[PDB]
Design an enzyme around this catalytic site. Structure first.
Site, short mmCIF file in Angstrom:
data_model
loop_
_atom_site.label_atom_id
_atom_site.label_comp_id
_atom_site.label_asym_id
_atom_site.label_seq_id
_atom_site.Cartn_x
_atom_site.Cartn_y
_atom_site.Cartn_z
N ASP A 399 0.82 -1.24 0.00
CA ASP A 399 0.00 0.00 0.00
C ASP A 399 0.84 1.28 0.00
O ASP A 399 0.52 2.27 -0.69
CB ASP A 399 -0.94 0.04 1.23
CG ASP A 399 -2.14 -0.89 1.10
OD1 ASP A 399 -2.41 -1.44 0.00
OD2 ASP A 399 -2.83 -1.09 2.13
N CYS A 433 -1.76 3.15 -12.79
CA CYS A 433 -1.92 2.88 -11.38
C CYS A 433 -3.15 3.68 -10.95
O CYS A 433 -4.22 3.44 -11.54
CB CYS A 433 -0.66 3.17 -10.56
SG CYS A 433 0.12 4.77 -10.87
N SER A 434 -3.00 4.58 -9.97
CA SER A 434 -4.07 5.46 -9.54
C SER A 434 -3.94 6.79 -10.31
O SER A 434 -4.70 7.09 -11.22
CB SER A 434 -4.04 5.68 -8.03
OG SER A 434 -2.71 5.95 -7.60
N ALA A 435 -2.97 7.59 -9.96
CA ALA A 435 -2.75 8.90 -10.64
C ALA A 435 -1.94 8.72 -11.94
O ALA A 435 -1.92 9.60 -12.82
CB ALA A 435 -2.05 9.82 -9.66
N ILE A 437 1.46 8.19 -12.28
CA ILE A 437 2.78 8.82 -12.35
C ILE A 437 3.79 8.06 -11.47
O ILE A 437 4.93 7.95 -11.88
CB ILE A 437 2.69 10.31 -12.00
CG1 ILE A 437 2.19 10.55 -10.57
CG2 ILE A 437 1.82 11.03 -13.04
CD1 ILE A 437 2.17 12.03 -10.15
N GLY A 438 3.43 7.53 -10.30
CA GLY A 438 4.45 6.97 -9.39
C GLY A 438 4.81 5.52 -9.71
O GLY A 438 5.90 5.25 -10.23
N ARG A 439 3.92 4.59 -9.39
CA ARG A 439 4.11 3.18 -9.78
C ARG A 439 4.28 3.05 -11.29
O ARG A 439 5.17 2.34 -11.76
CB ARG A 439 2.93 2.31 -9.35
CG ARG A 439 2.82 2.18 -7.84
CD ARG A 439 1.68 1.31 -7.38
NE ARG A 439 1.32 1.59 -5.99
CZ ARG A 439 0.31 1.01 -5.38
NH1 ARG A 439 -0.41 0.12 -6.04
NH2 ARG A 439 0.01 1.32 -4.12
#
Ligand SMILES: Nc1ccc2[nH]ccc2n1
EC number: 3.1.3.48
Length: 502
Positions: A399, A433-435, A437-439
């Site tokens: 998470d 992923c969600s936004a 950009i990160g994962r």
């Protein structure tokens, strides 16, 4: 300007700075000492300093009492244009008006700290080109600095040379022995980058580009990781400092008509790389927008957010239009009780229509870290448009933070790679992923880096931070945290060690 981030300041230094050198509306950002991923925006208002926490666990910067952002620079730009928009828990307005600049040069690519003129000459001769330069601490005059620059021809004949310019530091101002006295080495360097120094006999000391210190031979990855493990932090810092160059326009995503198609209102696709949707509903006034960007290594990718209820149809238009045959999903639908991605695929053996697109889920297969769903996508009314789309759904990403071991990710990307390569003229691989950009950025950068090693074997050149900066120029804030940066290096290292085992 691009110097409002203070990497080595403490809370008390930040307060005294704002109080002694700033005025109401002055601000700076700084990292926590203790909890990587935590940052503070320090702001003077009403003759006192407020500290506002910003948290990043891998998906976005979350400002307490503000919005979520892809980068600190984008956060700062947003509030420097929207005053009254950053609110205190009181409900009072906090204005960001006057960045308070940092003099510390350690995050600049051209700063090398402890380095003799002799090692500088070797690096400029080996790695350097015409106009390649660095700044270092002086050996002859402790407390001073030296600017070292290569000039001449790029084609050891002696028509190249290195020139060393003494930089005096006098009462915390810097000069080259005459003329202007600068507040920071950064200001000195920027000035002589604009207005280069000319030697008596005409050589122009052109400051074209810093020396490259991040490129390694992939086979020596182990040495670099050991080396960076005692640092990763400074290298990441230097990379983060470069994000002030990437404030490209995002006007299409900021249009009124597109507002509710963004999961996060300030995490938007760059205009220059956004996926444009054609063939839209003639009634729908704007039907060409999705929060997605094409990412080219410089095999391509589409980096996108997790679907909303109202963008599922757009998502499938995108997959269809771009001839994508592989989807990489790196989030669960729900994490910490929050929807991160709506379910945009049908249950196993079921068929659903998503606007003009129909998708059948033919078969699911469970593996240790992922589920593979074999989907068939076609346009309603047009049977011969059916193509298989393989959704690789990575299900065990933690998470917060990153996995301890890169093996599951590497196996997963190997499989995605072989599937993509097995399909003649497949379009870009979709990654979300969600936004987005990160994962998403983390998986893409790992894949770009491993692909080089795949083509060119273990004796080839990789450059992690240049790869990330290149991807960041195509979608805002790709690769969010230091833990993700470290994981990328870990992933590459594991990949190299397994080849060497053979
Ligand atoms: N110099 C900078 C600018 C923005 C940043 N965000 C996280 C670290 C960092 N450093």
């Amino acid at each position: 300007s691009r110097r409002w981030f203070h990497p080595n300041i403490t809370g008390v230094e930040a307060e005294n700075l704002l109080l002694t050198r700033g005025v109401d509306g002055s601000f700076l950002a700084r990292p926590s000492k203790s909890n990587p991923g935590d940052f503070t925006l320090s702001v003077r208002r009403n003759g006192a300093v407020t500290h506002i926490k910003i948290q990043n666990t891998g998906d976005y910067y979350d400002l307490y009492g503000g919005e979520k952002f892809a980068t600190l620079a984008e956060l700062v730009q947003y509030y420097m244009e929207h005053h009254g928009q950053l609110k205190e828990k009181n409900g009072d307005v906090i204005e960001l008006k006057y960045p308070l600049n940092c003099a510390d040069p350690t995050s600049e690519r051209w700063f090398h700290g402890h380095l003799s003129g002799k090692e500088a000459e070797k690096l400029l001769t080996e790695k350097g080109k015409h106009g390649s330069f660095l700044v270092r601490e002086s050996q002859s005059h402790p407390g001073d600095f030296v600017l070292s620059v290569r000039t001449g021809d790029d084609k050891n004949d002696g028509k190249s040379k290195v020139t060393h310019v003494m930089i005096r530091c006098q009462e915390l101002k810097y000069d080259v022995g005459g003329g202007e006295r600068f507040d920071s080495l950064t200001d000195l360097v920027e000035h002589y980058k604009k207005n280069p120094m000319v030697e008596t006999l005409g050589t122009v000391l052109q400051l074209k580009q810093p020396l490259n210190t991040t490129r390694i031979n992939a086979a020596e990855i182990e040495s670099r990781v050991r080396e960076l493990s005692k640092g990763f932090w400074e290298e990441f810092e230097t990379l983060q400092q470069q994000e002030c160059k990437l404030l490209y326009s995002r006007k299409e995503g900021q249009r009124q008509e597109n507002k509710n198609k963004n999961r996060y209102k300030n995490i938007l696709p760059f205009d220059h790389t956004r996926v444009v949707l054609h063939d839209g509903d003639p009634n729908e006034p704007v039907s060409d927008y999705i929060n997605a960007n094409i990412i080219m290594p410089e095999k391509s990718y589409i980096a996108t957010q997790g679907c909303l209820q109202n963008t599922v149809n757009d998502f499938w238009r995108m997959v269809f239009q771009e001839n994508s045959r592989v989807i990489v999903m790196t989030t669960k639908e729900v994490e910490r009780g929050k929807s991160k991605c709506v379910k945009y695929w049908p249950d196993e053996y079921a068929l659903k229509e998503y606007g003009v697109m129909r998708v059948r889920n033919v078969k699911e297969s469970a593996a240790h870290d992922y589920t593979l769903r074999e989907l068939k996508l076609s346009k309603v009314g047009q049977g011969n448009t059916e193509r298989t789309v393989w959704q690789y759904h990575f299900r065990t990403w933690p998470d917060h933070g990153v996995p301890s071991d890169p093996g599951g990710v590497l196996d997963f990307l190997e499989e995605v790679h072989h599937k993509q390569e097995s399909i003649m003229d497949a379009g870009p691989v979709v990654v979300h992923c969600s936004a987005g950009i990160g994962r998403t950025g983390t998986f893409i950068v790992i894949d770009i880096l491993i692909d080089i090693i795949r083509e060119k074997g273990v004796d080839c050149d990789i450059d992690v931070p240049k790869t990330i900066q290149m991807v960041r120029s195509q979608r805002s804030g790709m690769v969010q945290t230091e833990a993700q940066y470290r994981f990328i290096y870990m992933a590459v290292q594991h990949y190299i060690e397994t080849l060497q085992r053979r």
